[PDB]
Structure 1
Amino acid sequence: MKSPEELKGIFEKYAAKEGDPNNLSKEELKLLLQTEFPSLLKGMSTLDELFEELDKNGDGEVSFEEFQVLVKKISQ
């Protein structure tokens, strides 16, 4: 549905709301998605997004180096 040029507009609109007007805080990302793409977060799974966050080179595997980003999250 949306084009990449539209998405540039969208990024600029919501990034200007608070703080640095050229960058998106977590609160502005939440408002962007709730307003423009409200079904994006209910289709996503947390496990799938953690895996994408860890797998930086996109080979479908988490190496021991890449696992170090998960180790930072563990409470202890």
Structure 2
Amino acid sequence: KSPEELKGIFEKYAAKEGDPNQLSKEELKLLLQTEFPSLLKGGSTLDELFEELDKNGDGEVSFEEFQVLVKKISQ
């Protein structure tokens, strides 16, 4: 794999609502659930999680901030 794949996957869910550049809170859920259920190697409340992830989304996440997830899958 490569970042491009993770970008494609990010885009895959971002494309549902709120433009393919952003992951809505509700969208991240489905994404993580399909793509990283085990890889999250933890779990927490949607708000807390998406908020940790939301470096500067303040409505929706984006590939930019989602790199924190990309880091934590190996965590």
Aligned residues: 75
Verify the 8 A CA contact 2:13 2:27 in the aligned structure 1.
Answer: yes
Shift of 1:52: 11
Verify the 8 A CA contact 2:53 2:61 in the aligned structure 1.
Answer: yes
Q: Deviations over 1:26-74 (max 9, x none)?
A: 1111111000001244525689988995999999999999999999999
Shifted more, 43-52 versus 56-65: the winner is 56-65
Distance 2:11 2:66 in 1: 33
Select the structure that is richer in strand: 2
Q: What TM-score do you get using the length of structure 2 for normalisation?
A: 0.49
Identity score, percent: 97
Q: Which of the pair has more CA radius of gyration?
A: 1
Higher relative contact order (CA 8 A, sep 6+): 2
Distance 1:62 1:73 in 2: 15
Shift of 1:20: 2.4
Shift of 1:18: 1.1
Unmatched runs of 5 consecutive residues or more in structure 1 = none
Poorly superposed stretches of 4+, deviation over 6 Å: 45-52, 54-76
Taking a change above 3 Å as real, the CA distance of residues 41 and 48 of structure 1, as seen in their structure-2 partners, is farther
Q: What TM-score do you get using the length of structure 1 for normalisation?
A: 0.49
> What's the C-alpha RMSD, in Å, of the aligned pairs?
12.1
Select the structure that is richer in helix: 1
Unmatched runs of 5 consecutive residues or more in structure 2 = none
